Amino acid sequence: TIKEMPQPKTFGELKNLPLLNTDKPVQALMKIADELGEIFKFEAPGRVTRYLSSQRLIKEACDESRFDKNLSQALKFVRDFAGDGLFTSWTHEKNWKKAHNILLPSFQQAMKGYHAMMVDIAVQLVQKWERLNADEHIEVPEDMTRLTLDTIGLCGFNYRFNSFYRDQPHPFITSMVRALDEAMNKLQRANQFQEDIKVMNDLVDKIIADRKADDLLTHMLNGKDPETGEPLDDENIRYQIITFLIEGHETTSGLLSFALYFLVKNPHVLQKAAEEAARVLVDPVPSYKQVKQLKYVGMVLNEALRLWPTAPAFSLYAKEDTVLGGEYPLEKGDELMVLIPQLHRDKTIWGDDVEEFRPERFENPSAIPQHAFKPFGNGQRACIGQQFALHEATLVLGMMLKHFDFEDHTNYELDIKETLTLKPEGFVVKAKSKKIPLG
Ligand code: HEM
């Protein structure tokens, strides 16, 4: 028939809330999913969502004729600062489709155009590590953030954040992390955020004052949509700046940190990746063409996104009354949340060793089922920056693996911090230079 949907214990008016009393709500939900399976309902005072974990259900939810992108409480909390820019706009808001057509050509060909500036920041990362004394170590996510922020600032906006000239995190990041944490904390509330938003806006004006006195910024200021013919308004443009400075770097830093984490934890995987880097990256600096030949480095990165997709959930709503999976009636407006780390652990797809780090799972991707691997979201609301993220990550990891041997000197225990994105907090390593000349 039509089944009761599983649901964890409720606690009077508190609903299911006392079950997410944590700074790590996604990891908590993954445990509820392990217990209750492919679908469960979750209620907090005033609001209700349904968490999906199977490819069979997610495949249905990904049917855009039936479900569209929802702004979850977390993205509503975020719309305050990025407005109706691409990430926090509803698909039916005019600026969504409009920015999408106006911005999409900036993301392979734009990539060729971005390569050199990606290499500029990546060489700054390598030089930093080459210059460390023997007694020193690397703070991995902290340096990855320095890299990915500087990369978007330069490739997107021709602005230099100069992150590597500071040994504290950039002033822009510190607000960012506190605003993301606060949006996440706000979630477990039954009943500085202005300061952090103002500090972000503060930087946007710097950028805006800069071009004033061929890249993303160009297309934001000058580009017009081949439908309505209308350009972006200034309000929206400020909104797209803020948007690309966050999503533009946080998830990719997380990815590169998880990737190095898994490599040091899997020395045979590391060996094979380093072997490819050396034979492929024969020039002083890498070319666009060489980065494209780093087949096993891309498999490594995809397998890190499989385990810990760094933007770990996306939210959908029923466009109309519908039945999910031939069993679960939903009313127009009902929220579904896709738990991507749980999707990537669906044993009917992946086999029964879902926790192991095996890049060879991606050896021939043209044989992974559709909707089984979704680290970049779904459909027309999928990550516009997918190829940019991947090219950057593959370039940088490739250069890292060419130029150094890595040591897990603290025997680091994975600790994943959640700011509605994921990163391995406190991950540190030592890197011994192979003493290989740069350009
Ligand atoms: C590994 C790195 C990345 C991951 C895992 C990731 C993940 C995602 C996911 C899952 C979504 C869908 C959000 C939702 O459905 O609510 C998304 C959307 C988006 N992402 Fe990414 N992202 C990454 C890198 C980037 C980069 C480098 C950029 C920009 C340069 C970026 C820009 C965006 C934008 C603008 C959107 C909204 C797209 C739209 O709705 O039109 N992402 N991303």
Swiss-Prot record:
Changing residue 86 to E: Ineffective covalent modification of the heme macrocycle. Extensive formation of Fe(II)CO complex in the substrate-free form. Changing residue 251 to A: Contrary to wild-type, significant decrease in the formation of the high-spin complex via substrate binding, and decreased substrate-induced reduction potential shift with saturating concentrations of arachidonate. Changing residue 384 to P: 10-fold increase in binding affinity for lauric acid. It comes from the Bacteria. GO terms for molecular function: aromatase activity; flavin adenine dinucleotide binding; FMN binding; heme binding; identical protein binding; iron ion binding; NADPH-hemoprotein reductase activity; oxidoreductase activity, acting on paired donors, with incorporation or reduction of molecular oxygen, reduced flavin or flavoprotein as one donor, and incorporation of one atom of oxygen. One of its GO terms (cellular component) is cytosol. Changing residue 384 to E: Ineffective covalent modification of the heme macrocycle. 2-fold apparent limiting rate of flavin to heme electron transfer for arachidonate-bound enzyme. Induction: By pentobarbital. Expression is negatively regulated by repressor bm3R1 at the transcriptional level. Signal peptide: none annotated. Coiled coil: none annotated. Changing residue 376 to H: High substrate-free turnover rate constant. Negligible substrate-induced spin-state and substrate-induced heme reduction-potential shifts on addition of saturating concentrations of arachidonate. The record marks 251 as: Important for catalytic activity. Residues 1-439 are annotated as: Cytochrome P450. Its main location: cytoplasm. This is Bifunctional cytochrome P450/NADPH--P450 reductase. The lineage of its organism: Bacteria, Bacillati, Bacillota, Bacilli, Bacillales. The gene is cyp102A1. The chain holds residues 2 to 457 of 1049 of the full protein.
